[PDB]
Symmetry: T
Subunit: 166 residues, 12 copies
C-alpha cells in the first residue's frame, strides 16, 4: 500500500522521533501541495474557470492553515520544521511539473485528487505513528486533516462525475 511505503520512508533513518519525522514530511508535502494548487489557479483554461479559480484559493488557504498548524506542532514537541523552498521540494513525495496552459480542466481535477489522496495516506501514517508513540494531540491534528482531505476528495471526485473511491 501507499501507507506502508510512506511509513517505511518516513521512519527510514527520543521518545517521539517517528512523530517528529512524519510531521516534518507533512511540512514538505503541504508546501508542495499548495504550490500545485496555485499552479491550477493560474494556468487553468476552460468552461468552469470562473468557479474553479476561486475554489483553488479556498483549497490553498486550507492547505496553508494546515502547514502553519503542522509546523508549529512540530516546533512545540521539540522538532525543527523544514523552512526553505529547496527543503520542501527535496523532501516532499509529491512531484511538480512546469506550468502549461494546455492542460485541460479534467487534467487539473485529476491531479488535485491525486494530491489529496496522497495527503490522506500520509495522515493515516501520522495516525499510526502517533498511536504508537502516545501523542494524542498530534493524533487529533492528523485525524482532522485526514477527515478534511477525504471530504475534499468526495467533492472534487463529484465534480469529475465520479465517487470518492477512497
Amino acid at each position: 500500500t501507499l501507507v506502508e511505503n510512506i511509513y517505511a520512508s518516513v521512519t527510514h533513518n527520543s521518545k517521539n522521533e517517528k512523530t517528529k519525522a512524519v510531521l516534518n514530511q507533512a511540512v514538505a508535502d503541504l508546501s508542495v501541495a499548495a504550490s500545485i494548487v496555485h499552479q491550477v489557479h493560474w494556468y487553468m483554461r476552460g468552461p468552469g474557470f470562473l468557479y474553479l479559480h476561486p475554489k483553488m484559493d479556498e483549497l490553498l488557504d486550507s492547505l496553508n492553515a494546515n502547514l502553519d498548524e503542522v509546523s508549529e506542532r512540530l516546533i512545540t514537541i521539540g522538532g525543527a520544521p523544514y523552512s526553505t523552498l529547496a527543503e520542501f521540494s527535496k523532501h516532499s513525495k509529491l512531484d511538480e511539473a512546469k506550468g502549461t496552459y494546455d492542460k485541460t480542466v479534467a487534467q487539473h481535477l485529476a491531479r488535485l485528487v491525486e494530491v489529496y489522496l496522497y495527503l490522506s495516506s500520509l495522515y493515516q501514517v501520522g495516525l499510526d505513528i502517533t498511536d504508537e508513540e502516545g501523542d494524542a494531540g498530534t493524533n487529533d491534528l492528523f485525524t482532522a486533516a485526514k477527515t478534511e482531505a477525504e471530504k475534499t476528495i468526495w467533492m472534487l471526485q463529484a465534480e469529475r462525475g465520479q465517487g470518492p473511491a477512497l
Copy 2:
C-alpha cells in the same frame, strides 16, 4: 549598483519581453521572500517574540498578495509565471539557509531588511523596464510594491534602532 545588476540579469536572454521577464523574476523572488519570512515566524526566540511573531504573518500575507497580483499580471500580458517550488528556488536572486533556533532577533530583523532592500531594487528595475516598454499598468504595480517595501524598511529599521537608509 544592485539595480544595474538585476537589470542585466533579467534582460540577459515581442514588444513586452523585458516586462514579462522582470515580472517572472518577481514571482520567484516573492515566493522565496515569503518562505524566508515564514522561517522567522517559526524559528524566532527572544524578547519581543509575542509581537514580532504575528508581525511576520502580516508581512507574509502582504507578500503573498503581491505574488498573486504579479503572477496574474504576467498571465494577463501574455506570459507564463513560474509555478513550482524548484523554479522559484532556482531563479530567485534571494538565498535561503536551513532554519536554526540559535539565530538572534537582531539577526532575523537584519535579514528581513536585506530581503525588502532587494525587493525595492527589483521593483526599481521593474519601473525602468515598464517605462521603456510603455506598460503603464505594470508600472503602477511596481510603484505600489516599491512604496510598500520602502515603508516596511523604515519600520523594520526603526525596530532595529536605525534610519531607513534606502
Copy 3:
C-alpha cells in the same frame, strides 16, 4: 389542469376550512420538497457540482423558511399542522425515490423544475381558496411563495438551457 386537480383533492373531505386544508397540504409538500432537494445535494455527480451543491442549500433554506411560515400561519388561524415524517410522506402529492448516484445533473435539474412547478400550482390553489374565504394574510403568503417559486423556475430552466414555460 393540475390546479383543478389539487383544488378537488384539497377540498375533498368553519369559515376557513378550505384555507386550513390548503395550508396543511403545503406543510406536507414543502417537507417532501425539502427532502428531494437534500437528495440532490447529496447524490449529485458531474461537472457543475461545485456550484450546484451549495445552490441546493440555498433552495433548502428557502423551502424550510416557507415551511415554518406556512405551519405557523395554520396554527395562528386555528388549524393543526402535520408534524411527523409519516404524515408528510402520506399526504404530500410529491413522490420520492431511493437515492442513486447514477442520476445525471440534467435529471436532477429536471426533477427540481417539476417540484417547483407543482408548488407554484399548489400556491395558485391557495390564492383561489384564500380569495374565496376572505383571508388576505394567507393570500399574501401564497402570493409571495408563488412569486419566489416562479423565479426559481426561470433560473433553473435557464441552467437547463430552456425558457421558464410556466
Copy 4:
C-alpha cells in the same frame, strides 16, 4: 442495555460495513429527531413558551447540522445515505405521534430528553463500531455528537428540575 440492542440491530444484516450501517442509522434517527423537535416548536402551549419556542430552533439547527455532516461522511467513505422521508421514518428507531396541543410543557421536555438519550446511545454504538473498524475520522464525529447530546441532556434535565442521569 439500549447500546447492546442498537448494536445488534445496526449490524444485523467490505472493511467498513458496520461503520456505514451505523452512520445510515444516524441519518434516519437525526431526521426523525428533527421532526420531533419541530413538533414541540409548533404545538407547545404553557408558561415558558416564549423562551422554549426559540430554544427548539437552536436544537433543530444543531440536529440538521449533524445530519448534513453524518450523511456526507457516509457518502465520503463509500456509502449511500437514506434520502427520502419514508426511508427515515421506516428505519429510525424513534417513534413519532400525531401532534396535539394538549401535551404539557413537562411532557415535551420529557420527550426531548428521551430523544437525546437515545441519540447518545446510538453515538456510543458508533464509537464502538468505528474503534472496531479503525475509522478515526468517523470516531471523532460520533464523539463530538455524543458530547453535544450529553450537554443537551444536562440542560434540558435542569429545566425539568432534575440531574442529567446519563
Copy 5:
C-alpha cells in the same frame, strides 16, 4: 361584531376619506397600544420577568414602526395624522389604567392579548375600507399589520397556555 362597531365609528362623520379616517384611528390606537406595552415593561413583577421584560421592548419597537409607517402613509395620501398625546388618548378606542405593581403576570398577558385582538379587528376594518376605496398600497399595509398582530396573538396565547382563538 367589533369590526362592525369600529367601521361605524371610523366612518361616522374626497375619494379616500374613509381610508384617511381609518389610518388616523390607527395612529391614535398604536400610540396608546405602545403606552400600554411600556406599562407592562415597567410594572411587571413575577417569575418570567427576565424574558417577558425584554419581549415588551420587541413589541414596543414593532408598534412604533407600525405607527411611523401608518402616519406617513396618511400624510402621503393627503391626510393629517394625530400628533399630540391628548389627541391619541381622546381618539383611541383603547383605555389605559394607572400603573400598579400588584397586577399579575397573567393579567398583563391577558391585557396584551386584548390589545392585539383589538388592533387585528381595526386592521380588518382597514382592509374593508381600502378595498372599497381602491387603495392597494394602504390595503397591503393593513394586511401586513394584521398578519403580524395575529402571529403575536398566537405566541402570547401560547405563553398563557391557550390557543390563538382569533
Copy 6:
C-alpha cells in the same frame, strides 16, 4: 387622466399579453428615470448639494433595483424585456434633455417629482392590468413600487415646501 392615456398606449398593439406589455413599458421608463436622476446627481449646483447629491444615489439604487425585479418578472412570465439604450429611449414615455449646469435646485426637484408622479400612474395601470389578467405576483410588484413612489413624492414635495398632491 394620465392613467387612461398610459393604459391606451400600453395596450394599443396570450392570457397575459397586457401584463407583459405594461412590465416592458416599466423596463423602458425605469431606465430613463435612472438616467434623469443621474443627470441631477452630476449637474446640480446650489445650496443643499452636499445632501441632495448623495440622496440622488439612494434614488438611483432604488430605481435600478425596481428595474432588475421588473425585467426578471417579465422574463419569468414568458416575456422579453427591452435591453438596449435605444429601446429604452424610444419606448419610454419620459423625455430627457441635454444636461446643463444652469438648472436650479428647485428645477431639479420639480423634474424628480414629475418623474415619480409619472411612475406612480404607470404602476396604477399595472395594478388595473394585473387585476384584469389575474396575475397576483405582478400585482404585488406594482403595489410595492407604487407605494415607494408615493412615499418618494411626499418627501421630495416636502423638500420643495409643498404637500404630496397625489
Copy 7:
C-alpha cells in the same frame, strides 16, 4: 427663574420623596417632548427637510432612551412612574398644539430649542434635589441628560444662525 418655578411645582405636594417627584416629572416631560419631536418629523415642509426629517428620529431615539432610564431609575429607588398618555399630558409642563403643515422650518426649530431649554432647566432642578437628598446615582443621570440637552441646544441654535444662549 424657570428653575425656581419647576422646583416649587415639583415639591409642592420618605428620605427620597423630592427625587422621586422630579424623576416622575421627567417621565411626563420626556414623553411629551418625544411627541413634539415626532410632530416635527411628520409635519415639516421646506428646504432642509431631507436632513432635518431624519435628525428628528435621532432626537426621538435619544429622548426615548432618556425616558426608559429615568422611569426605571424611579422604579429602582421605590417610586411609581407615570405610564399612561393621559398622565403624561396632564402632568407635563410642556404644551402641545394640533399639527399643521403651515408651520415653517424656522418655527419648528424654535419650538425644539424651547423644549430642550425647558428640559435643561428641569434637569438642573433634578441636580439640586438629588444633591439635597444625597442620591449620587440619580444626580449623575440628570448631569448626563443636562449635558446632552445643552449640546443639542448649541447645535439646533447653530442651525438657526444663533449662539446657544443657555
Copy 8:
C-alpha cells in the same frame, strides 16, 4: 446600618488611605461575588433554568469588568490589590457555601439579591470615603457601580415577584 459597619471595618487599621482600603475591599468582594454567581450558573435546577443560566453569565461578565476596573484604579492611585484566591476569601465580607443541586431557584435568586444589596452598601461606603478624601475619579467609579447594582436588584427582585426594597 450595614453601611456604618462596612465603614468601621474598612477604616479599622497617606492622603488616600481610606480610598485605597475601600477599593481593596471591593477587589475581594467582587471576586467572591463572581464565584457565588458562577455557583448558581452551575448548580441551578428548576423551571426557568434555560434563561436564568445565561443570565448568570451576563452578571458574571459585569462583575469581572468591575473587578478589573476597581483593581486597576487601586494600582493607579498607588495601592496594591489583593491578587490570590486566599486573600479574596479571607478579606471578603461575603460568605460562600459548598455547592448543592438541591437549592431551589427561589433560594438562588434570594442569595443573588443579598449579594447585590451588600455590594450596593459597600459602594455607598466608597462614595462617602472618596467624598471625604477628595477623589472624584474613584467617586464616579463607585457611583456607576452602585447604580448598576441597584438596577440589578430591581430586576432580580421583579423575577422573585417583589419590589426593589433598597
Copy 9:
C-alpha cells in the same frame, strides 16, 4: 490599429480639450457597455447560468463605478458629461442588438470579450491624451481602468478556454 482610430475620432472636432473629449467618450461607452452586460444577465440560457448570471452583476457594478468616477472627473476638470440615454447611444462606438434568448453562452462570452477589448483600447487612447496634456490624475484613472479591463479579459478568455490575447 483600433487605438489610432479611436484617437482620430475622439480628437476630430482650452489646454485640456482632448482629455475632456476622451472622458466624455468613456461616459458614453461605459453606459452602453453596462447595458450590454445587463442584456447578458437577463437573456442568457445554458449550463453555467447559475454562476455566470451573478458574475454579470459584478461586472455591471464595476462598470457603473467607472462611469461615476469618469463622469465626475470630467465635471471636475471643467467639462460636461453626456447624461441622456440618447447621447450615450449616439456617441458610443459600441453597438447594441435586440435581446434574444437564442444566443448561446459562448456567444455572450465572446461579446463581453469584444466589449472589454474595446474599452482597453479606449483607455490606452486616454493614457496617450492625458500624457500629452499633462493631466496626471486622469492618467491614473485610465491606467486603473485599463488594468481592470485587461484582468477581466484574461478571466473571461479563460472561461472560453482561451488565452488573454491582448
Copy 10:
C-alpha cells in the same frame, strides 16, 4: 514524574469516579491558574508591559473558557464541581503568593511557564484516566486543553529566548 504524582493524588480517596476526580482537580487548578495570570496582568512592570499586559487577558479568557467547559462536563457526567474560592485554593496543586510590584518580567514569564507545564501534566493524567474508564468525550476535552497548553508553553518560552522543553 509529575504525572505519576498527580495520578496518585487524584485517585487517592461508580464506573467514572476517577474521571470525575480529575475533572474536579482541573476545576480547582484552572481557577488558581486564572488568579495567577490576573496577578501578572496587574502587578507587572518593565519593558514589554504594553503587549504582555493584554496578552494576559487572552490567557485569562482561555483559562476561564476551559474552566466553564471542564466544570459543566463534570456536572454532565454526574459529578459536583468545586464552586467556592476556598475549595479552589485548598484543592489546587498550584500555590499562590502575595502580589508584589518588584517581580521582574522574566520572573512573571517563568511562573506562567510553570503553571502551563503543570496544567499539561494534569491533562495527561486526564487522558490516562479517561482512556482507562472509556470516556471518549472527556478524553477529547483533555486532549484539546493539553494541545492548547503545549502551544502556550512554546510561545511563552520563545518570549523568554528558550525552546518549549516539554
Copy 11:
C-alpha cells in the same frame, strides 16, 4: 502662477532634496489646513449647519490621513518632518485668523475652497519635483492627493452654486 511661486519658495534654500522639501511643505500646510477646517466645524452658524458640521469631520479625517502618509513618506526617503505646532504655523503658506461666530456659511465655504485650491497647486509642484528627481512613489502620493483635492473643490463649489473653476 501660484505653482511657480510655490516651486521657487520650496526650492529656495542629495539626489532627492527638492522632493524632501516639498513633502515637508505639505506637512506644514496639511496641519494648518486641518486647523482651518476644525475652526469651521466649531464656529459655523447658519442654515445647513447640521450637514456641514459633520462634513467638516470627513474633510478633517482625510487631511489628517494625508498628513500621516506625507510625513511618513518623508521619513522613509531620509527626511525629517516638521513635528511642532510652531514649525507648522511658521512654514505653512496658509494663514489663519482668530475664530469668530459672525463669519457666514458662505464665507466658510469660500475659505475652504481657497485652502483646497492652494493644496492642489502645492501638489502640482510636488508632481513636477518628483518627476524631475525620479521618485515614482512620491509622485503617486501627490497625484492621489491632487485628485482628491480637485474632487473636493468640485463638491464645495457646487454647494456654493459655482463650477469647479480649477
Copy 12:
C-alpha cells in the same frame, strides 16, 4: 504645587468665566499634547517601535476626542475656543522641541509621562473651578479626562518599569 500655579495662571485676567478659561486652556494644551504624541509616533527608533508606534495612534485618537469634546463644551456654555495653531502654541503651558531621531525610547516615554502628569493637574484645576462655579456637566468632563489620564500614566510608567507616582 503645579495645581496652584495652573489655577493662578488660568484665572489671572459672567458667572462661568473661570470655567470658560480652564476649558480654553485645555483646548490649547490638548492640541499641543497631540502634536507631541505625533512627534513620538514619527521620530521613535529602537526595540519596541512596532508596538509603541501604533500605541501612539491610540493616544492621539483619545487626545483629539478630548479636544473636540472640550472645545464644543466651551462653545455650548457661551465661550470661544482657540482655533489656530498659533493660539494653541502661544497659550499652552506645554513646550515643544524640534524632532530628532536620536531621542531614545526611554526619553520618549518620559516625555509622554510628563505630558499626562501635566494634563492630570490641569484637569484637577478644572474640577476645583467647576465645583466653585456650579457647572456639574463640565465637572464630569474633567473627571473622566483626569481618570483616563491617570490610567495612561499607570500604563506608561509600567512600560518604563516604574509605579504610577501620581
